[PDB]
Amino acid sequence: NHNAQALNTLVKQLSSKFGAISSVLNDILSRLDPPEAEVQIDRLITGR
């Protein structure tokens, strides 16, 4: 149960935004330009 809960928490952490506008990667890639999308991609990568 501890292993399963660890896996579930690790797969749930993808729902977090970590300060970004959205947790979905495609949403950030399609809503912002690369000049201002990297600042959110970096936060998502750091959080994950």
């Binding site: 928490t9 749930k12 952490q13 729902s15 977090s16 935004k17 970590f18 300060g19 959080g47």
Partner: protein, 204 residues
């Protein structure tokens, strides 16, 4: 193409250098490398510059950082004395600045402030490489134990005629102090927007 800055004289063997905008600090030495005509800078494993080509002369100079090393201070309790010893670990005595502020060379580093003695006692302060210091501050090779030899023979045996019932203590930890940390009151104490921003970090 560069800026209007003028060039200075080249000095070799700890000065600041500026080769085509590449600023840094280190010593310059005649290198034996084989730089190609289209290669201007060198790069080591650590992604730092280890060699550079001068813009004026086509000679290659290695970039090596200046001498440094750890500084371990050997001192007894303050309630005993105020004299201290300095151990320049990893640096030889012939090589030893950032700090503003009786010499023996050990395999761990140069020790300044302690007098080496030939007599050996129990290790009081672990220094390194079998050397230990004790309180003036003296340095000595730590003794492994008292000298003893067993009188072994083909027909010799030792049997005790008496005995001593001794008691020895043994301390073992069983538990430690519990701790409960509230992330909200710790990170965003009496703050609402901080808590709303922290809720976005998941279930940490």
């Amino acid at each position: 193409v560069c800026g209007p800055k003028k060039s200075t004289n080249l000095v070799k063997n700890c000065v600041n250098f500026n080769f085509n905008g590449l600023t840094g600090t280190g010593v310059l030495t005649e290198s034996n490398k084989k730089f190609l005509p289209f290669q201007q800078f060198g790069r080591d494993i650590a992604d730092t510059t280890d060699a550079v080509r001068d813009p004026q002369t086509l000679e290659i100079l290695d970039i090596t950082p200046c001498s440094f090393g750890g500084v371990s201070v050997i001192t007894p309790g303050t309630n005993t004395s105020n004299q201290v010893a300095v151990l320049y670990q990893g640096v030889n005595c012939t090589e030893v600045l950032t700090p503003t502020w009786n010499v023996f060379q050990t395999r761990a580093g140069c020790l300044i402030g302690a007098e080496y003695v030939n007599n050996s006692y129990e290790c009081d302060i672990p220094i390194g490489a079998g050397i230990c210091a004790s309180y003036s501050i003296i340095a000595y090779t730590m003794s492994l134990g008292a000298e003893n030899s067993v009188a072994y023979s083909n027909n010799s045996i030792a049997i005790p005629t008496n005995f001593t019932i001794s008691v020895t203590t043994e301390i073992l930890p069983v538990s430690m102090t519990k701790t409960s940390v509230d992330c909200t009151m710790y990170i965003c104490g009496d703050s609402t927007e901080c808590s709303n921003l922290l809720l976005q970090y998941g279930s940490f």
